Protein backbone atom coordinates (compact mmCIF):
# COMPACT_ATOMS: atom_id res chain seq x y z
CA UNK A 1 0.00 0.00 0.00
CA UNK A 2 0.99 3.67 -0.37
CA UNK A 3 -0.07 7.07 0.90
CA UNK A 4 0.34 10.60 -0.40
CA UNK A 5 -0.44 13.89 1.31
CA UNK A 6 0.00 17.57 0.51
CA UNK A 7 2.03 19.67 2.92
CA UNK A 8 1.55 23.46 3.11
CA UNK A 9 3.71 26.24 4.62
CA UNK A 10 2.12 27.77 7.72
CA UNK A 11 3.19 31.33 6.78
CA UNK A 12 4.85 33.45 4.11
CA UNK A 13 8.36 32.60 5.33
CA UNK A 14 7.95 28.78 5.26
CA UNK A 15 8.62 28.65 9.01
CA UNK A 16 7.01 25.18 9.17
CA UNK A 17 4.87 22.85 7.07
CA UNK A 18 1.54 21.25 8.06
CA UNK A 19 0.03 18.05 6.62
CA UNK A 20 -3.55 16.88 7.35
CA UNK A 21 -3.68 13.61 9.28
CA UNK A 22 -6.81 11.56 10.09
CA UNK A 23 -6.96 10.25 13.67
CA UNK A 24 -9.72 8.09 15.11
CA UNK A 25 -13.13 6.70 14.07
CA UNK A 26 -14.94 8.65 12.77
CA UNK A 27 -11.91 10.60 11.46
CA UNK A 28 -10.72 13.69 13.31
CA UNK A 29 -8.50 15.67 10.97
CA UNK A 30 -5.55 17.48 12.52
CA UNK A 31 -2.81 19.48 10.79
CA UNK A 32 0.48 18.01 11.98
CA UNK A 33 4.09 19.11 11.49
CA UNK A 34 6.00 16.16 10.00
CA UNK A 35 9.31 16.04 11.86
CA UNK A 36 12.15 13.73 10.73
CA UNK A 37 14.11 14.97 13.81
CA UNK A 38 11.88 13.39 16.50
CA UNK A 39 9.97 10.20 17.02
CA UNK A 40 6.77 11.08 18.88
CA UNK A 41 3.29 11.56 17.43
CA UNK A 42 1.71 14.05 19.81
CA UNK A 43 -1.41 16.19 19.45
CA UNK A 44 -3.33 18.90 21.24
CA UNK A 45 -6.29 17.15 22.83
CA UNK A 46 -9.33 17.51 25.06
CA UNK A 47 -6.82 16.79 27.88
CA UNK A 48 -4.61 19.84 27.21
CA UNK A 49 -4.77 22.54 29.89
CA UNK A 50 -7.37 24.94 28.56
CA UNK A 51 -5.20 28.05 28.99
CA UNK A 52 -2.50 26.40 26.86
CA UNK A 53 -4.78 26.12 23.78
CA UNK A 54 -5.29 29.08 21.41
CA UNK A 55 -7.26 28.06 18.31
CA UNK A 56 -5.75 24.63 17.65
CA UNK A 57 -7.87 21.69 16.55
CA UNK A 58 -7.91 19.15 19.39
CA UNK A 59 -8.09 15.38 19.34
CA UNK A 60 -10.95 14.09 21.52
CA UNK A 61 -10.35 10.39 22.26
CA UNK A 62 -13.76 10.04 23.94
CA UNK A 63 -15.39 10.58 20.51
CA UNK A 64 -13.27 7.91 18.77
CA UNK A 65 -14.64 4.36 18.85
CA UNK A 66 -11.16 2.94 18.14
CA UNK A 67 -9.24 4.88 20.81
CA UNK A 68 -7.82 2.90 23.76
CA UNK A 69 -5.93 4.39 26.70
CA UNK A 70 -2.45 2.91 26.94
CA UNK A 71 -2.65 2.31 30.67
CA UNK A 72 0.28 3.66 32.69
CA UNK A 73 2.12 5.16 29.72
CA UNK A 74 3.46 8.70 29.82
CA UNK A 75 5.62 10.82 27.55
CA UNK A 76 7.71 13.92 28.05
CA UNK A 77 9.73 15.62 25.33
CA UNK A 78 12.00 18.67 25.06
CA UNK A 79 13.11 20.02 21.69
CA UNK A 80 16.43 21.66 20.80
CA UNK A 81 14.78 25.11 20.86
CA UNK A 82 13.60 24.58 24.46
CA UNK A 83 10.00 23.64 23.59
CA UNK A 84 8.35 20.99 25.76
CA UNK A 85 5.14 18.99 26.08
CA UNK A 86 3.98 15.92 27.96
CA UNK A 87 0.95 13.82 28.80
CA UNK A 88 -0.58 10.35 28.45
CA UNK A 89 -0.91 7.92 25.56
CA UNK A 90 -3.80 6.48 23.57
CA UNK A 91 -3.63 4.06 20.69
CA UNK A 92 -5.92 4.76 17.74
CA UNK A 93 -6.21 4.49 13.98
CA UNK A 94 -4.09 7.03 12.07
CA UNK A 95 -4.27 7.64 8.31
CA UNK A 96 -1.99 9.82 6.19
CA UNK A 97 -3.03 10.35 2.60
CA UNK A 98 -4.97 7.08 2.37
CA UNK A 99 -2.31 5.05 4.26
CA UNK A 100 -3.82 3.65 7.47
CA UNK A 101 -2.10 2.27 10.57
CA UNK A 102 -4.17 0.69 13.33
CA UNK A 103 -3.07 0.83 16.95
CA UNK A 104 -0.68 3.77 16.49
CA UNK A 105 0.47 5.42 19.71
CA UNK A 106 -1.12 8.89 19.89
CA UNK A 107 0.47 10.96 22.65
CA UNK A 108 -2.11 13.29 24.13
CA UNK A 109 -0.57 16.54 25.37
CA UNK A 110 -1.72 17.55 28.83
CA UNK A 111 0.87 20.34 28.97
CA UNK A 112 2.49 22.20 26.05
CA UNK A 113 5.09 24.95 26.08
CA UNK A 114 4.11 28.49 25.14
CA UNK A 115 5.89 28.05 21.77
CA UNK A 116 3.20 25.63 20.59
CA UNK A 117 0.31 27.53 22.21
CA UNK A 118 1.04 30.70 20.23
CA UNK A 119 1.14 28.74 16.92
CA UNK A 120 -2.53 28.12 16.17
CA UNK A 121 -1.76 26.54 12.78
CA UNK A 122 0.08 23.45 14.16
CA UNK A 123 -2.11 20.87 15.95
CA UNK A 124 0.77 18.51 16.71
CA UNK A 125 3.89 16.75 15.51
CA UNK A 126 4.37 13.46 13.66
CA UNK A 127 7.86 12.14 14.32
CA UNK A 128 9.66 10.33 11.52
CA UNK A 129 13.11 9.71 13.05
CA UNK A 130 14.01 6.23 14.30
CA UNK A 131 11.88 4.71 17.04
CA UNK A 132 14.78 4.54 19.51
CA UNK A 133 14.11 8.27 20.20
CA UNK A 134 10.44 7.83 21.18
CA UNK A 135 9.80 9.17 24.69
CA UNK A 136 6.93 6.92 25.80
CA UNK A 137 7.68 5.24 29.14
CA UNK A 138 7.86 2.50 30.30
CA UNK A 139 7.00 0.86 26.94
CA UNK A 140 8.69 2.71 24.06
CA UNK A 141 6.39 3.17 21.07
CA UNK A 142 6.97 2.89 17.31
CA UNK A 143 6.64 5.76 14.86
CA UNK A 144 3.98 5.95 12.17
CA UNK A 145 6.58 5.03 9.54
CA UNK A 146 7.78 2.02 11.54
CA UNK A 147 4.22 0.73 12.02
CA UNK A 148 3.38 1.29 8.34
CA UNK A 149 6.61 -0.26 7.02
CA UNK A 150 5.46 -3.84 6.57
CA UNK A 151 2.40 -2.89 4.52
CA UNK A 152 4.22 -0.34 2.34
CA UNK A 153 5.18 -1.32 -1.19
CA UNK A 154 8.74 -0.10 -0.46
CA UNK A 155 9.95 0.93 3.03
CA UNK A 156 10.53 4.55 1.97
CA UNK A 157 9.03 7.96 2.26
CA UNK A 158 9.88 11.10 0.33
CA UNK A 159 9.83 14.79 1.24
CA UNK A 160 9.23 17.26 -1.60
CA UNK A 161 8.93 20.59 0.20
CA UNK A 162 7.89 23.68 -1.71
CA UNK A 163 9.39 27.16 -1.68
CA UNK A 164 6.53 29.48 -0.62
CA UNK A 165 4.21 26.80 -2.05
CA UNK A 166 2.62 23.43 -1.16
CA UNK A 167 4.63 20.23 -1.42
CA UNK A 168 4.18 16.46 -0.99
CA UNK A 169 5.00 13.68 1.47
CA UNK A 170 4.75 10.26 -0.19
CA UNK A 171 4.87 6.93 1.65
CA UNK A 172 5.83 3.66 0.00
CA UNK A 173 6.83 4.81 -3.51
CA UNK A 174 9.22 7.15 -5.33
CA UNK A 175 7.49 9.51 -7.76
CA UNK A 176 9.89 9.52 -10.68
CA UNK A 177 8.16 12.60 -12.15
CA UNK A 178 8.98 14.73 -9.07
CA UNK A 179 12.73 15.23 -9.76
CA UNK A 180 15.25 15.72 -12.55
CA UNK A 181 18.40 13.69 -13.19
CA UNK A 182 19.33 10.83 -10.90
CA UNK A 183 18.91 10.29 -7.17
CA UNK A 184 22.22 10.15 -5.28
CA UNK A 185 22.06 7.90 -2.24
CA UNK A 186 24.34 8.27 0.77
CA UNK A 187 24.81 6.17 3.92
CA UNK A 188 22.86 6.90 7.12
CA UNK A 189 24.06 6.39 10.68
CA UNK A 190 21.27 5.50 13.11
CA UNK A 191 23.51 5.56 16.19
CA UNK A 192 21.92 8.72 17.61
CA UNK A 193 18.42 7.90 16.31
CA UNK A 194 18.48 10.60 13.61
CA UNK A 195 18.66 10.50 9.83
CA UNK A 196 22.35 11.32 10.15
CA UNK A 197 24.58 11.53 7.09
CA UNK A 198 27.81 13.15 5.86
CA UNK A 199 27.84 15.91 3.28
CA UNK A 200 30.91 15.98 1.07
CA UNK A 201 31.44 19.76 1.10
CA UNK A 202 30.12 23.10 0.05
CA UNK A 203 30.44 26.15 -2.16
CA UNK A 204 29.32 29.76 -1.79
CA UNK A 205 27.76 31.39 -4.84
CA UNK A 206 29.89 30.62 -7.87
CA UNK A 207 33.03 30.00 -5.79
CA UNK A 208 35.13 26.86 -5.80
CA UNK A 209 33.74 23.81 -4.07
CA UNK A 210 35.47 23.04 -0.77
CA UNK A 211 35.69 19.30 -0.16
CA UNK A 212 35.15 18.75 3.54
CA UNK A 213 33.08 16.30 5.56
CA UNK A 214 30.05 17.82 7.28
CA UNK A 215 28.19 15.43 9.55
CA UNK A 216 24.60 16.48 10.09
CA UNK A 217 20.96 15.42 10.24
CA UNK A 218 18.14 15.59 7.73
CA UNK A 219 15.44 17.39 9.75
CA UNK A 220 12.12 18.49 8.23
CA UNK A 221 11.14 19.84 11.70
CA UNK A 222 13.84 22.52 11.72
CA UNK A 223 13.32 25.66 9.65
CA UNK A 224 16.89 26.83 9.02
CA UNK A 225 20.25 25.39 7.98
CA UNK A 226 22.71 25.11 10.91
CA UNK A 227 26.33 24.50 9.84
CA UNK A 228 29.78 24.83 11.51
CA UNK A 229 30.99 28.32 12.29
CA UNK A 230 33.73 28.20 9.63
CA UNK A 231 31.25 27.46 6.82
CA UNK A 232 28.69 30.01 8.02
CA UNK A 233 31.36 32.70 8.31
CA UNK A 234 32.57 32.01 4.77
CA UNK A 235 28.99 32.34 3.48
CA UNK A 236 28.13 35.62 5.21
CA UNK A 237 31.50 37.21 4.37
CA UNK A 238 30.21 37.38 0.78
CA UNK A 239 27.18 39.52 1.76
CA UNK A 240 27.86 43.25 2.00
CA UNK A 241 27.11 44.49 5.51
CA UNK A 242 26.20 41.11 7.01
CA UNK A 243 27.22 40.56 10.63
CA UNK A 244 26.53 38.27 13.56
CA UNK A 245 24.26 40.02 16.07
CA UNK A 246 24.16 39.05 19.74
CA UNK A 247 20.83 40.77 20.41
CA UNK A 248 19.14 39.07 17.47
CA UNK A 249 20.86 35.73 18.06
CA UNK A 250 22.43 35.12 14.66
CA UNK A 251 23.58 36.53 11.34
CA UNK A 252 21.53 39.44 9.94
CA UNK A 253 22.07 41.31 6.68
CA UNK A 254 20.80 44.49 4.99
CA UNK A 255 17.42 43.70 3.47
CA UNK A 256 18.62 45.50 0.29
CA UNK A 257 21.40 42.94 -0.30
CA UNK A 258 21.09 40.09 -2.76
CA UNK A 259 22.17 36.74 -1.36
CA UNK A 260 24.48 34.23 -3.04
CA UNK A 261 23.39 30.67 -3.42
CA UNK A 262 24.78 27.86 -1.26
CA UNK A 263 25.78 24.46 -2.63
CA UNK A 264 26.16 21.32 -0.53
CA UNK A 265 27.65 18.00 -1.60
CA UNK A 266 25.93 14.62 -1.60
CA UNK A 267 28.54 12.07 -2.56
CA UNK A 268 29.61 13.26 -6.00
CA UNK A 269 26.43 15.25 -6.62
CA UNK A 270 25.65 18.88 -5.81
CA UNK A 271 22.48 20.43 -4.42
CA UNK A 272 22.17 24.19 -5.04
CA UNK A 273 20.13 26.29 -2.61
CA UNK A 274 19.08 29.53 -4.36
CA UNK A 275 19.97 32.70 -2.50
CA UNK A 276 16.29 33.67 -2.21
CA UNK A 277 15.71 30.58 -0.03
CA UNK A 278 18.14 32.03 2.55
CA UNK A 279 16.19 35.30 3.08
CA UNK A 280 13.97 35.14 6.17
CA UNK A 281 12.82 38.73 5.98
CA UNK A 282 12.99 41.65 8.40
CA UNK A 283 13.83 40.89 12.02
CA UNK A 284 10.87 43.11 12.98
CA UNK A 285 8.11 44.83 11.03
CA UNK A 286 9.55 47.78 9.14
CA UNK A 287 13.19 46.95 9.93
CA UNK A 288 15.81 47.20 7.20
CA UNK A 289 17.80 44.32 8.79
CA UNK A 290 16.86 40.86 7.54
CA UNK A 291 17.42 37.46 9.18
CA UNK A 292 19.61 34.84 7.51
CA UNK A 293 18.55 31.29 6.76
CA UNK A 294 22.06 29.88 7.31
CA UNK A 295 23.26 30.01 10.92
CA UNK A 296 26.01 28.52 13.05
CA UNK A 297 25.56 25.16 14.75
CA UNK A 298 28.19 26.01 17.38
CA UNK A 299 25.61 26.51 20.14
CA UNK A 300 23.67 23.33 19.23
CA UNK A 301 26.30 20.59 19.04
CA UNK A 302 24.98 19.05 15.81
CA UNK A 303 24.67 20.25 12.21
CA UNK A 304 21.07 20.43 10.96
CA UNK A 305 20.03 20.26 7.32
CA UNK A 306 16.63 21.86 7.89
CA UNK A 307 13.87 22.99 5.55
CA UNK A 308 16.08 25.68 3.93
CA UNK A 309 18.24 22.87 2.53
CA UNK A 310 15.67 20.11 2.08
CA UNK A 311 13.21 22.21 0.07
CA UNK A 312 15.91 22.67 -2.58
CA UNK A 313 15.81 18.90 -3.20
CA UNK A 314 13.69 15.82 -3.61
CA UNK A 315 14.63 13.72 -0.60
CA UNK A 316 14.23 9.96 -0.18
CA UNK A 317 14.13 8.54 3.35
CA UNK A 318 14.92 4.88 2.65
CA UNK A 319 14.06 2.82 5.73
CA UNK A 320 15.44 -0.45 4.41
CA UNK A 321 17.41 -2.62 6.83
CA UNK A 322 20.46 -0.61 5.82
CA UNK A 323 18.92 2.89 5.79
CA UNK A 324 20.01 5.46 3.20
CA UNK A 325 19.16 9.03 2.23
CA UNK A 326 18.63 9.97 -1.40
CA UNK A 327 18.91 13.47 -2.82
CA UNK A 328 17.89 14.70 -6.24
CA UNK A 329 17.65 18.06 -7.94
CA UNK A 330 14.16 19.23 -8.84
Ligand SMILES: NCc1ccc(C(F)(F)F)cc1
Nearest residue numbers: 037038079080219221222302
Ligand atom coordinates in the same frame (compact mmCIF):
# COMPACT_ATOMS: atom_id res chain seq x y z
N1 LIG B 1 13.13 18.86 14.66
C1 LIG B 1 13.43 18.01 15.80
C2 LIG B 1 14.76 18.32 16.48
C3 LIG B 1 15.00 19.52 17.14
C4 LIG B 1 16.24 19.75 17.75
C5 LIG B 1 17.22 18.77 17.67
C6 LIG B 1 18.59 18.95 18.33
F1 LIG B 1 18.73 20.23 18.78
F2 LIG B 1 18.68 18.07 19.38
F3 LIG B 1 19.58 18.65 17.43
C7 LIG B 1 16.98 17.58 17.01
C8 LIG B 1 15.75 17.36 16.41
